[PDB]
């Protein structure tokens, strides 16, 4: 057969 | 205590003063508000129109502290929703932060790196916008040293993370030349000894390999597969997860690209992966396996030789349903492209019963997948003249009862195949 295919932000705290 | 818990209006007052030190004081106060983990007043700070002021403070070379404080304040605004990040961008922060990458003060350039990371991390557009402003050159120059170990751990981790965001997201994927420009440094980070740098390096590689074969090739040709396979066996879950994702992405490509994963010795790690306590690891490992059994017969044979079929039987017998579903796919792919001997070996491993049991599932799609696998196995039995020996196996485990009942299933595709099997092999 064929093949089946399938934090960005960060706050700076103390 | 001096700049702790200021009101927004006091911050507005200090920033609107013509006193640089007063402005520095107010900016720090804002930074501390925005640095609180419990609902920082991001929208309040935005509504006060403080962003343009923060942005202008970024260029105050003679007052580095206010450069640092505003960069930190803007970073935390950019860490919010898309709207809040847009506000930072709208204020002209991108070019100002890129200028800060060359700051002689490490903590300031790091804050700029952090800020660009949050902006790029919002999505494709802002990512590509940060790239157009020319953030990549100055970013890579910060990593251009004989040995990464001489850089501060925190600094390196931030640089790696921001770079990973520049490699992230689709529709569209990052510009080809951008990926090419970044890859060499990324490969280097992929060999660093720090767990967080490794984790984010794998995530970057996973993003880059999450696309068409050409994208996969760009990465593969850099020779990172052996290293990925090694990290695939690491003890840290945060490292294994992205590493497995990357390997999984790579085997969705060409048979040759898949073969490199096999040659690197990846399959030896799968006895663990397919029994891993974390269900997400099991699911993605089985998914990866299904794309390997969709390969050539010599590759299917490699799966057999590593004794992974019994592990597929196990996952098919007991696992999170999503994992079991990937296992059903793995078997169908296996039976579709496998030889008669390979398919027979499947049956001898005990694939039949756990396969029949999943026909009680309510997921229509998995039933279709299983029914196709059965068809394929009978076809292999036909070439041996032992279709009947299989019919009894399926019947004794209560499989026939289920196929019979699937004739009154509500789905067209299901009952068609059901009765086809019933009247062709059971009559």
Coordinates of N, CA and C in Angstrom, one line a residue, chain B residues 27-135:
Chain B
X27 N 9.2 51.6 32.7 CA 9.3 50.5 31.9 C 9.6 49.2 32.6
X28 N 10.5 49.3 33.6 CA 10.7 48.1 34.5 C 9.4 47.7 35.2
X29 N 8.7 48.7 35.7 CA 7.5 48.5 36.4 C 6.5 47.7 35.5
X30 N 6.4 48.1 34.2 CA 5.6 47.5 33.2 C 6.1 46.0 33.0
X31 N 7.4 45.9 32.9 CA 8.0 44.6 32.7 C 7.6 43.6 33.8
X32 N 7.6 44.1 35.0 CA 7.2 43.3 36.2 C 5.7 42.9 36.2
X33 N 4.9 43.8 35.8 CA 3.5 43.5 35.7 C 3.3 42.4 34.6
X34 N 3.9 42.6 33.5 CA 3.9 41.6 32.4 C 4.6 40.3 32.6
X35 N 5.4 40.3 33.7 CA 6.2 39.1 34.0 C 5.4 38.2 35.0
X36 N 4.2 38.6 35.4 CA 3.5 37.8 36.4 C 2.7 36.7 35.7
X37 N 2.7 35.5 36.3 CA 2.1 34.3 35.7 C 0.6 34.3 35.7
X38 N 0.0 35.0 36.7 CA -1.4 35.1 36.8 C -2.0 36.2 36.0
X39 N -2.5 36.0 34.9 CA -3.2 37.0 34.1 C -2.5 38.3 34.0
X40 N -1.3 38.4 33.4 CA -0.7 39.7 33.2 C -1.6 40.6 32.4
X41 N -1.6 41.9 32.7 CA -2.5 42.9 32.1 C -2.0 43.3 30.7
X42 N -1.9 42.3 29.8 CA -1.4 42.6 28.5 C -2.3 43.5 27.7
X43 N -3.6 43.3 27.7 CA -4.5 44.1 27.0 C -4.5 45.5 27.5
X44 N -4.4 45.6 28.9 CA -4.4 47.0 29.5 C -3.1 47.8 29.1
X45 N -2.0 47.1 29.0 CA -0.8 47.8 28.5 C -0.9 48.2 27.1
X46 N -1.5 47.3 26.3 CA -1.7 47.7 24.9 C -2.6 48.8 24.7
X47 N -3.8 48.8 25.4 CA -4.7 49.9 25.3 C -4.2 51.3 25.8
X48 N -3.2 51.2 26.6 CA -2.5 52.4 27.1 C -1.6 53.0 26.0
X49 N -1.4 52.3 24.9 CA -0.6 52.8 23.8 C 0.9 52.8 24.1
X50 N 1.4 51.9 24.9 CA 2.7 51.9 25.4 C 3.7 51.2 24.5
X51 N 3.2 50.5 23.5 CA 4.0 49.7 22.6 C 5.0 50.5 21.8
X52 N 4.5 51.6 21.1 CA 5.4 52.4 20.3 C 6.5 53.0 21.1
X53 N 6.2 53.3 22.4 CA 7.2 53.8 23.3 C 8.3 52.8 23.6
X54 N 7.8 51.6 23.9 CA 8.7 50.4 24.2 C 9.6 50.2 23.0
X55 N 9.0 50.2 21.8 CA 9.8 50.0 20.6 C 10.9 51.0 20.4
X56 N 10.6 52.3 20.7 CA 11.6 53.3 20.5 C 12.7 53.2 21.6
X57 N 12.4 52.6 22.7 CA 13.4 52.4 23.8 C 14.4 51.3 23.4
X58 N 14.0 50.5 22.4 CA 14.9 49.4 21.9 C 16.1 50.0 21.3
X59 N 16.0 51.2 20.7 CA 17.1 51.8 20.0 C 17.9 52.8 20.8
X60 N 17.7 52.9 22.1 CA 18.4 53.8 23.0 C 19.7 53.2 23.4
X61 N 20.7 53.2 22.6 CA 22.0 52.6 22.8 C 22.7 53.1 24.0
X62 N 22.5 54.3 24.4 CA 23.2 54.9 25.6 C 22.6 54.4 26.9
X63 N 21.4 53.8 26.9 CA 20.7 53.4 28.1 C 20.3 51.9 27.9
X64 N 21.3 51.0 28.0 CA 21.1 49.6 27.8 C 20.0 49.0 28.7
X65 N 19.9 49.4 30.0 CA 18.9 48.9 30.9 C 17.5 49.1 30.3
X66 N 17.2 50.2 29.7 CA 15.9 50.5 29.2 C 15.7 49.7 27.9
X67 N 16.8 49.4 27.2 CA 16.8 48.5 26.0 C 16.3 47.1 26.5
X68 N 16.9 46.7 27.6 CA 16.6 45.4 28.1 C 15.2 45.2 28.7
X69 N 14.8 46.2 29.4 CA 13.5 46.2 30.1 C 12.3 46.3 29.0
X70 N 12.5 47.1 28.0 CA 11.4 47.2 27.0 C 11.4 45.9 26.1
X71 N 12.6 45.3 25.8 CA 12.7 44.1 25.1 C 11.9 43.0 25.8
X72 N 12.2 43.0 27.1 CA 11.5 42.0 28.0 C 10.0 42.2 28.1
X73 N 9.6 43.5 28.2 CA 8.2 43.9 28.2 C 7.5 43.5 26.9
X74 N 8.2 43.7 25.8 CA 7.6 43.4 24.5 C 7.5 41.9 24.2
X75 N 8.6 41.2 24.7 CA 8.6 39.8 24.6 C 7.4 39.1 25.2
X76 N 7.0 39.6 26.4 CA 5.8 39.0 27.1 C 4.5 39.4 26.5
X77 N 4.5 40.6 25.8 CA 3.3 41.0 25.1 C 3.2 40.1 23.9
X78 N 4.3 39.8 23.2 CA 4.3 39.0 22.1 C 4.1 37.5 22.4
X79 N 4.1 37.1 23.7 CA 3.9 35.8 24.1 C 2.4 35.5 24.2
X80 N 1.6 36.5 24.0 CA 0.1 36.3 24.2 C -0.6 35.8 23.0
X81 N -1.8 36.2 22.7 CA -2.6 35.8 21.6 C -2.1 36.4 20.3
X82 N -2.6 35.9 19.2 CA -2.2 36.4 17.9 C -2.4 37.9 17.8
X83 N -3.5 38.4 18.3 CA -3.8 39.8 18.3 C -2.7 40.6 19.1
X84 N -2.3 40.0 20.2 CA -1.3 40.7 21.1 C 0.1 40.7 20.4
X85 N 0.4 39.6 19.7 CA 1.7 39.5 19.0 C 1.6 40.5 17.8
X86 N 0.5 40.6 17.2 CA 0.3 41.5 16.1 C 0.5 42.9 16.5
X87 N 0.1 43.3 17.7 CA 0.3 44.6 18.3 C 1.7 44.9 18.4
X88 N 2.5 44.0 18.8 CA 4.0 44.2 18.9 C 4.6 44.4 17.5
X89 N 4.2 43.5 16.6 CA 4.7 43.7 15.2 C 4.2 45.0 14.6
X90 N 3.0 45.3 14.8 CA 2.4 46.6 14.2 C 3.2 47.8 14.7
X91 N 3.9 47.7 15.8 CA 4.6 48.8 16.4 C 6.1 48.9 15.8
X92 N 6.4 48.1 14.9 CA 7.7 48.1 14.3 C 8.8 47.4 15.1
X93 N 8.4 46.4 15.9 CA 9.3 45.7 16.7 C 10.3 44.8 16.0
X94 N 9.9 44.2 14.9 CA 10.7 43.2 14.2 C 12.1 43.7 13.8
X95 N 12.2 44.8 13.1 CA 13.5 45.3 12.7 C 14.3 45.8 13.9
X96 N 13.6 46.4 14.9 CA 14.3 46.9 16.1 C 15.0 45.7 16.9
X97 N 14.3 44.6 17.0 CA 14.8 43.4 17.7 C 16.0 42.8 16.9
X98 N 15.9 42.8 15.6 CA 17.0 42.2 14.8 C 18.2 43.1 14.9
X99 N 18.1 44.4 15.1 CA 19.2 45.3 15.4 C 19.8 45.0 16.7
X100 N 19.0 44.5 17.7 CA 19.5 44.2 19.0 C 20.3 42.9 19.1
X101 N 20.2 42.0 18.1 CA 20.9 40.8 18.0 C 22.4 41.0 18.1
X102 N 22.8 42.2 17.6 CA 24.3 42.5 17.6 C 24.7 43.3 18.8
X103 N 23.9 43.4 19.8 CA 24.2 44.1 21.1 C 25.4 43.4 21.8
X104 N 26.3 44.3 22.3 CA 27.4 43.8 23.0 C 27.0 43.2 24.4
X105 N 25.8 43.4 24.8 CA 25.3 42.9 26.0 C 24.5 41.6 25.8
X106 N 25.1 40.5 26.2 CA 24.5 39.2 25.9 C 23.1 39.1 26.4
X107 N 22.7 39.6 27.5 CA 21.4 39.5 28.1 C 20.4 40.3 27.2
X108 N 20.8 41.2 26.5 CA 20.0 42.0 25.6 C 19.7 41.4 24.3
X109 N 20.8 40.8 23.7 CA 20.6 40.1 22.4 C 19.8 38.8 22.6
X110 N 20.0 38.2 23.8 CA 19.2 37.0 24.2 C 17.7 37.4 24.2
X111 N 17.4 38.5 24.8 CA 16.0 39.0 24.9 C 15.4 39.2 23.5
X112 N 16.3 39.7 22.6 CA 15.9 40.0 21.2 C 15.6 38.6 20.6
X113 N 16.5 37.7 20.8 CA 16.3 36.3 20.3 C 15.0 35.8 20.8
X114 N 14.7 35.9 22.1 CA 13.5 35.4 22.7 C 12.3 36.1 22.1
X115 N 12.4 37.4 21.8 CA 11.3 38.1 21.3 C 10.9 37.7 19.8
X116 N 12.0 37.6 19.0 CA 11.8 37.1 17.6 C 11.2 35.7 17.6
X117 N 11.6 34.9 18.6 CA 11.1 33.5 18.7 C 9.5 33.5 18.9
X118 N 9.1 34.4 19.8 CA 7.6 34.6 20.0 C 6.9 35.1 18.8
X119 N 7.5 36.0 18.1 CA 6.8 36.6 16.9 C 6.7 35.5 15.8
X120 N 7.9 34.8 15.5 CA 7.9 33.8 14.5 C 7.0 32.6 14.9
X121 N 6.9 32.4 16.2 CA 6.1 31.3 16.7 C 4.6 31.4 16.5
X122 N 4.1 32.6 16.2 CA 2.7 32.9 16.0 C 2.1 32.1 14.8
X123 N 2.9 32.1 13.7 CA 2.5 31.4 12.5 C 3.3 31.6 11.3
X124 N 2.9 31.1 10.1 CA 3.6 31.2 8.9 C 3.9 32.6 8.5
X125 N 2.9 33.5 8.5 CA 3.1 34.9 8.0 C 4.1 35.6 8.8
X126 N 4.0 35.7 10.1 CA 4.9 36.4 10.9 C 6.3 35.8 10.9
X127 N 6.3 34.4 10.8 CA 7.6 33.7 10.6 C 8.3 34.2 9.4
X128 N 7.6 34.2 8.2 CA 8.2 34.6 7.0 C 8.5 36.1 7.0
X129 N 7.8 36.8 7.8 CA 8.0 38.3 7.8 C 9.3 38.5 8.6
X130 N 9.5 37.8 9.7 CA 10.8 37.9 10.4 C 11.9 37.5 9.6
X131 N 11.7 36.5 8.7 CA 12.8 36.1 7.7 C 13.1 37.1 6.7
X132 N 12.0 37.8 6.2 CA 12.2 38.9 5.2 C 13.0 40.0 5.8
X133 N 12.8 40.3 7.1 CA 13.6 41.4 7.7 C 15.0 41.0 7.9
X134 N 15.4 39.8 7.6 CA 16.7 39.3 7.7 C 17.2 38.9 9.0
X135 N 16.4 38.2 9.8 CA 16.8 37.8 11.1 C 17.8 36.6 11.2

